[PDB]
């Protein structure tokens, strides 16, 4: 019965209308732009308030993978979706689970603040401007789903005299189209996945393109082992489980050697001058091809930028530059929250399980998409919001505020804790855990050992086989049919689009390629 405020129709957002349609809640939707999809949808045009995209842009996260737990990709859909293809399949999405109802569109959410009851009724005062005509109305809940990568982060003080510069420069969000550097000399400054898509998509037409790293990067291909998609191999419950239960120095080393097995990380100057801290790796199938053939060059970092020129530390060669392209990633904040409420310090908004503001009374505000797992935020910001939906309807309960505040402190603190694969800083999370976690919380995580005596089968390709989200809708609230079904032909869909020619599952894979043989018993 309970009524529910949803703010942005993003990925997020459209998960949120869906779990609460599905836990029998209310769900008003508002977002400020005039479709759904948010990031997704690219338009001509850079929205302020709404994720930006390039044309180019395609998943880094593989088709059975980073899709809703119970609505896959078509089977005609490639293995790493376009943009424009992952937009149809968010609006299809949208169109099934008859969410397009609940959805009023462009309405800014200018403010929700705590109704002056709040401490005994829960509710929210959320005051939207539609038509330039702002409106209050009470909600009993309200769900956030701005996500971030929307505000741009551009640290000008960090690019010494980059005022002078008499060349055009602007942040990866303002690119859409590579047009613009025909036959100019750009230079790319960081090499976030943005950056390294963009300098490579440069050096198609641009005179000479250069990509400036400041830590370096670790680089790896969709295609991976075999032409397997990377997260349909590496993000699996077995491969995780080893990782997790493995020194930090080891498999760091470890990971060095199968990222270097491709191409010599430090012959093309990438390989991270911080080893032991291992920063998200970037993923782009291009780029080395680029290096070798001299259209893209890595440059160690700004040392200044002059009238029509830039130089770089370590090199001496001062760069002739006509473009410069800030791939320096974006902040997040949320206006329409008071400080009370949400936090934003330090990357960080200081949430329980990265969601619940934790010293609220009532848990009736939900923050969904404001984490950054090992993994698709598809089914995290899904999965984050199974759990949530059901804490507002009181069928699952946070614990005290006591334990959480102490709690949410100890991942704020940043603490390596060692062994696993450390998980960095801000919205650091692993995939299988965070999911795992909440999955038990709502009750869907599946019995694998019990599995395995009734069910050997899908026992087996749910443990050593890629963590599919369809796995999530196996057993508990939410079940779905066809996830059993779903899971073991997994691969016959990611091999039906690539194998678009003839000729005359595949559980586990080849990313513990020397390390199932390294530790092996030396029987004494
Ligand atoms: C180039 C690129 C590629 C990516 N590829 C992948 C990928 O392959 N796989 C993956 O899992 N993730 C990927 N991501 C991450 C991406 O953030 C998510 O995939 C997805 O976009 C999450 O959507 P969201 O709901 O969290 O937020 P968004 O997509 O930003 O949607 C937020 C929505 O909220 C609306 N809004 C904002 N403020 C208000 C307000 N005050 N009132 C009302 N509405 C408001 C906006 O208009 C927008 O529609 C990628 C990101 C980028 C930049
Ligand atoms: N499909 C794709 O391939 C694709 C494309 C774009 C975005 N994405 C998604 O979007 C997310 C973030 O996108 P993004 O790449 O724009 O952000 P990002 O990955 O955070 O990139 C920002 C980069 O800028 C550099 N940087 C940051 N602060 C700096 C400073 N003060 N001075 C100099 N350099 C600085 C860093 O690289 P250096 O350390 O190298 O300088 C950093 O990695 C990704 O994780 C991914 O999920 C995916
Ligand atoms: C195979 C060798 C394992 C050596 C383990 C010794 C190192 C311990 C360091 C801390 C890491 C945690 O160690 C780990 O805990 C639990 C056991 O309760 C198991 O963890 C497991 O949890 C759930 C089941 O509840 C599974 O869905 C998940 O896929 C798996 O990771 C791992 O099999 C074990 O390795
Ligand atoms: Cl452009």
Not at 192 to 211: C, M, P, Q, R, Y
Not at 430 to 449: C, G, M, R, V
Not at 490 to 517: C, G, H, N, Y
């Amino acid at each position: 019965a309970k009524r529910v405020a949803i703010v942005g129709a993003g990925v997020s957002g459209l998960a949120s209308i869906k779990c609460c349609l599905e836990e029998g809640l209310e769900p008003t939707c508002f977002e400020r732009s005039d479709d759904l999809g948010g990031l997704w949808r690219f338009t001509e045009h850079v929205e302020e308030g709404r994720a930006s995209l390039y044309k180019s842009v395609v998943s880094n996260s593989c088709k059975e993978m980073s899709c809703y737990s119970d609505f896959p990709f078509p089977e005609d859909y490639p293995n790493y979706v376009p943009n424009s293809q992952f937009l149809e399949y968010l609006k299809m999405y949208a169109n099934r689970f008859n969410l397009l109802k609940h959805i009023q569109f462009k309405t800014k959410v200018c403010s929700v603040t705590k109704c002056p009851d709040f401490t005994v009724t829960g509710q929210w005062e959320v005051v939207t401007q539609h038509e330039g005509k702002q409106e209050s109305a009470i909600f009993d809940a309200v769900m956030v789903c701005t996500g971030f990568l929307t505000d741009p982060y551009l640290p000008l003080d960090s690019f010494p005299g980059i005022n002078t510069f008499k060349g055009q420069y602007f942040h990866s969000r303002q690119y859409k189209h590579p047009d613009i550097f025909k036959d100019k000399r750009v230079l790319v400054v960081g090499m976030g996945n943005s950056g390294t898509d963009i300098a490579v998509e440069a050096s198609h037409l641009a005179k000479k393109v250069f990509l400036s790293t400041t830590g370096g990067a670790w680089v790896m291909s969709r295609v991976f082992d075999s032409g397997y998609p990377w997260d349909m191999v590496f993000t699996t419950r077995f491969q995780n489980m080893l990782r997790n239960s493995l020194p930090t120095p080891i498999v760091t080393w470890l990971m060095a050697r199968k990222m270097n097995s491709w191409f010599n990380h430090a012959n093309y100057g990438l390989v991270p001058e911080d080893r032991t801290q291992l920063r998200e790796p970037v993923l782009n199938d291009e780029l080395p091809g680029c290096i070798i053939t001299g259209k893209v060059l890595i440059k160690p970092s700004i040392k200044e930028v002059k009238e029509n020129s830039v130089i770089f530390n370590n090199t001496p060669k001062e760069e002739p530059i006509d473009i410069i392209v800030f791939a320096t990633g974006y902040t997040f904040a949320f206006p329409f929250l008071d400080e009370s409420v949400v936090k934003v310090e330090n990357g960080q908004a200081s949430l329980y399980k990265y969601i619940f503001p934790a010293h609220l009374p009532k848990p009736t505000l939900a923050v969904i998409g404001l984490i950054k797992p090992l993994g698709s935020i598809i089914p995290t910001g899904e999965t984050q919001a199974r759990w949530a939906v059901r804490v507002l309807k009181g069928i699952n309960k946070l614990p005290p505020q006591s334990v959480m505040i102490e709690e949410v402190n100890a991942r704020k603190e940043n603490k390596p804790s060692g062994f696993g694969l450390c998980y960095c800083k801000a919205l650091q999370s692993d995939y299988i855990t965070y999911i795992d976690e909440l999955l038990t919380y709502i009750n869907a995580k599946p019995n694998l050992l019990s599995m395995l005596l009734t069910d050997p089968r899908l026992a087996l390709t749910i443990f050593f086989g890629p963590c599919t989200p369809y796995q999530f809708r196996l057993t508990g609230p939410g079940k779905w049919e066809g996830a059993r079904n779903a899971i073991l032909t997994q691969w016959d869909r990611t091999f039906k689009v690539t194998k678009t020619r003839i000729v005359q599952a595949s559980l586990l894979k080849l990313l513990s390629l020397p390390v199932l043989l390294l530790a092996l018993l030396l029987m004494c």
